[PDB]
Amino acid sequence: IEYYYSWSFACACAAFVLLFLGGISLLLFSLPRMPQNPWESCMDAE
Amino acid sequence: FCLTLQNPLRKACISIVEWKPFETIILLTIFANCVALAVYLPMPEDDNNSLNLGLEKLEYFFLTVFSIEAAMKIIAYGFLFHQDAYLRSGWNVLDFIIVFLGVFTAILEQVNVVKALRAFRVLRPLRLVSGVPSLQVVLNSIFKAMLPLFHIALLVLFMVIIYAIIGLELFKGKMHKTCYYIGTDIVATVENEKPSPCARTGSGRPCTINGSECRGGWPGPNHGITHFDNFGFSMLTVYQCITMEGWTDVLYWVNDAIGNEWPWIYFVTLILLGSFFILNLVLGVLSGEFTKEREKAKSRGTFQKLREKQQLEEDLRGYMSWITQGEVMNRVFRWKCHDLVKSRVFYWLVILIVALNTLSIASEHHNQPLWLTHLQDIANRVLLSLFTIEMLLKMYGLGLRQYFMSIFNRFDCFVVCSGILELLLVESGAMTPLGISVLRCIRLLRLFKITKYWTSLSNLVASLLNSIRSIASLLLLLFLFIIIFALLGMQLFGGRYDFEDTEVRRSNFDNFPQALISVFQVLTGEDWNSVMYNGIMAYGGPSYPGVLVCIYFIILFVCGNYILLNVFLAIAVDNLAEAESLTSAQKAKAEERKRRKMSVRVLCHRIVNATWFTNFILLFILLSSAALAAEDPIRAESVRNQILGYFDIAFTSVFTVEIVLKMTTYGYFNILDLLVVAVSLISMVVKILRVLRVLRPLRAINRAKGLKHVVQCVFVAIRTIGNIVLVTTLLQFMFACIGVQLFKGKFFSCNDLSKMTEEECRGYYYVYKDGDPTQMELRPRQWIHNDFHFDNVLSAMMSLFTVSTFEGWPQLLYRAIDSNEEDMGPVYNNRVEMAIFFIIYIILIAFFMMNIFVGFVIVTFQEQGETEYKNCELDKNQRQCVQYALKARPLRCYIPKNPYQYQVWYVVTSSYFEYLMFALIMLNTICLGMQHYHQSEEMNHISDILNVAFTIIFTLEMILKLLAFKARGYFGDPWNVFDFLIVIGSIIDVILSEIDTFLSAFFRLFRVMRLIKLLSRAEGVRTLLWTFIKSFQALPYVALLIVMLFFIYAVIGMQMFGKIALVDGTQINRNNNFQTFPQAVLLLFRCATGEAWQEILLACSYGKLCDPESDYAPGEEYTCGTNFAYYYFISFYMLCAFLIINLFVAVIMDNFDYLTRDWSILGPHHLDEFKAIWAEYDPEAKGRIKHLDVVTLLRRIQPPLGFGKFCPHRVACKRLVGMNMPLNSDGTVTFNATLFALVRTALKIKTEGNFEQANEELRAIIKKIWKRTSMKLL
Amino acid sequence: MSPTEAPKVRVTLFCILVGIVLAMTAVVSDHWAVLSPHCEAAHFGLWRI
């Protein structure tokens, strides 16, 4: 009695790492972004 | 002074009494009492020597002397309240407090016949501060610099709390099981191993000791002190980790119990985040504060105090050189020795015989040949008389008087006199086995003679003597702090480290000298947690009051280190300032003097040139660097190591293709592209080449332009450190020699400390487990040598580097204090005066280290702004306010329409809401830090009643917010998104905890993250946070250098030491090793943080037991180790340190605008609040607003930006029309240009006709306008 | 158009289109374990054994 995963653990451990990290990167790619100057503000005119 | 209405002068000539010596008699009295609190000897269990009694008797005298003066100052001054005038001063309050407290304790004691009230006497030294009116001022500047650290304090406090709670849940009660011998109640552990958690079935570690089983009634990892059972212990352990001392210990215990797959995240993040980040922020704010203070001095009057007197001294020596040659200017050979002394022959042949005496000292080692000893003494003999004659010929050849004149000459007198003084001394017969040595080293002093020819050294020395002269008053305070804590130590811990074990605790507070050393030790932070544990055990253990002693150590460390900060920062700031100031002054002195005497081939370039080619190649470096890191060290016969070898032969065909195509078009960085490609094809001494195969990640420094330019800058930082490094490396060497003269052949000892000779340590001896005269095992006796010693000059030096990194320096210190005679084992507490050597070295090194670090900073500054100039009509404060006024912009408030939605919007935006929510989040916090290990079942369910009820409340606030922002403006605020995230997760958590019991320790972490909302209101913390979090993004290449550092090293590391077996009790084990890539990187981080790296270095040396998996001729298991571990480790340490100081400087500088802002006058902090009032007049931006709301805008403004605390009828009515503004249609004046003349008024204020001249300047020194200034010109 | 039609946000959003189906590949296929007594070889999943 042993254990071995071949077809659908490493599938979901490639869909975990996809959805967990394609979500955090979409988050940082979707926000307004850091202003980088005093005039710039997060969430502003335009 | 005079009361002006007191009682008459029937006795009130007390104000006559107090003239000159009563201020000094009392001072020496407060000094003698200090000398008395220190000669005291704390004895355990109530014993007492007859001298302590004598001291208590003298105590009464001391008391009566401090108690009458506290009445003779409420006589002078005036009545109850005029004495209050005495009390008016803050210091008197302390004086009164002292004496009062004293007699109080005395009387109490008497009546009884309290052992605590005696701990308040260690306060009297403070009184030594009221006296010296200088110390007062320093104590003042220390409290003012600490005022702007409030925002960082909040942050650090909340960081510890958050981590503490996460720690709590995460590992609360998971460390109570340890390996036990079966049936017995004894802990099973190897030799140099610490008892650690264990686990029966699971990810944790299992029992490995024979006849050992996993039990579970264990108090904890450090005598039940380090764990996460409640909020208090959790908090303590977290702070301990944040200080960076013993953090890996905690990380390993959590692994050993939960599995190593996840607890690493928590810890690394902590050390990184908390520790390093916080350090940066604190170093930054302080630096800023110091700069402003210096600026306050230099612009007031302090530049001309140090320029004149440095010029009036160099004009004095020029005046006195015009005299001393006029006074000086019998036979012919006495003039031929005048020609020679100043020549260039004699300069190159004083360096000849000084180099023979440096070589001899270095030559001195333990067990040296007989011809060597002979030769050394021979040379010194062939030199004492050679030193006799030149001195003899010098003082008689050019005059007996002006020989006295030379600073250098005075020392040449001292050499031969004490050089020949030891000639008959060592011959007399006294000396002994320690003096005949201290004499020998002195010969080292002759190198100083060369200083005479070393002009640089002479000056840099005065430069160094100036900084140490200014911080003189700060330094005294540091010592005063140390003495006081040493005394408090003697009081809480003196005579209590009396546990019935055979374990020796060298760091205690038994007497004054020892207590001093322990305090210094806790101050360097080396092993401070271990020192604290002893103190805790001295009060019963980790229980209620018993633990409260740990507050002593916390305070000590923290505060003492704050004083250290001041010292170092002050030294740097004053020092850096002088260097910029006088080096530039000697530069304006420089060239003003030198002006006076003067007065088919194309498509392969297309592909190579093409941009896509690069993104196709820089992800073959991303694959080939994953193939170096996936290699298996121990087993070369693996299928993994074979099938990665085909990935070797894949890519190094392709970089060949890149190479040959590159020499189809073109005919230093490309000799590196040739080398990498050849190495693989050759590798398919082979062993040596393989290490040189990790160089591939270094071929990506040319492809990217960002990387190329920063290795250039780093290489330029190691060119402006010459005179200082020279002084420093001279220091290291000299101290190494002193060490060899003091501890040569004295770092040897026996297994059982009974045998003192090598002859004696033969045979076998008994060892006793837990000091049980009934439980003993047999062991062979062996004469061992300490790993770090002072046998030769290359050894003493390695020792000093480690003592300089503060890693394991107390061990060395104690071995030295125990040193006996050459070839003889230790004698407990033999010579405690060696501690002096150790402490002085540490101090001097700290000083010189700082200077070198600061100089590197100055070079970088020159690379940046220091080199640059901007002499246009607009200064610093104009560029950071006008360019902001050009590039500004509107906002988005979203005031919506209608009463039902608008009213809802109002409740939620009301202050009753802010405060309420805040209060609720505070309560939730308090309810989280309430969980502990082993609570009740009624406590168990109301925690699920509450966590579902808090979710409710929060999901009920979000609803309101959503209803009041149509979901368009709700998800518009970056904080609302965070709110949403928290809510959803918190709910899922509840539902989970539910579907669990109806029929994931990651969701219970959503409760804790709520605290981050608090950061939504704190505007100073948020602001500071953003400021720095914004710089770490402007400099992403330096961080890349660090990353690349760890990568190369990890790879080389694996290769070099990836086969050493993981044996317990050693430094290479299951928690620390080079077996896998991730593990190697963890090890290096551990090293960068300075956690016992020197012990690792030794663990990675030659004769190490090989992993069973690795192959080897039956009889070669012990051939695995490499003495290359010395170059690897030292080099990694240094390079690492270098890169780190280069990242802090970078960030700090790029942020100096906000740091040294002097928030008084102006910043963008006024320019922010303008728009946040303008947001109430703009829903969305649109540019302009009505003119009816313009006058109501100026009523909302702070008066340093707008108009006063006066009424706006006269100044604010007249100025708004008279100062310029653009005139468009009736209710249209723009955002973009109203803010201009509103800040053009407040500073940079101009006369009429030249309204084009402000617009003239706003195009040259400013960036291209972009066409927006055409309304900001008019 | 700047946060929704940039390519850097659509490379990521197409990447989620891969993980939306690979997590659907897992949630129907029951192949992520092998019972191996030695025949009683069983393949576990969520829904079928």
Ligand SMILES: CCCCCCCCCCCCCCCCCC(=O)OC[C@H](COP(=O)([O-])OCC[N+](C)(C)C)OC(=O)CCCCCCCCCCCCCCCCC
């Ligand atoms: C912005 C400013 C920048 C400042 C720059 C400063 C940064 C300095 C860098 C220091 C960071 C230190 C990181 C330490 C890493 C700790 C890892 C660890 O200890 O794990 C132990 C273990 C390793 O297992 P193991 O091999 O010990 O297993 C043996 C099992 N026992 C112990 C029972 C015998 O945990 C893991 O398995 C996690 C895997 C590690 C993955 C984490 C990434 C590490 C860094 C990259 C290497 C990973 C390769 C690529 C991964 C692909 C993506 C998943």
Ligand SMILES: COc1ccc(CCN(C)CCC[C@@](C#N)(c2ccc(OC)c(OC)c2)C(C)C)cc1OC
């Ligand atoms: C391996 O490289 C490093 C490892 C750790 C650290 C963190 C500590 N840093 C060296 C800063 C310590 C320096 C400093 C602080 N803070 C400090 C000096 C002496 C100290 O005790 C006497 C002290 O440690 C408590 C801190 C001074 C110079 C400001 C930095 C590193 O690079 C410098």
Ligand SMILES: [Ca+2]
């Ligand atoms: Ca340390």
Ligand SMILES: [Ca+2]
């Ligand atoms: Ca340490």
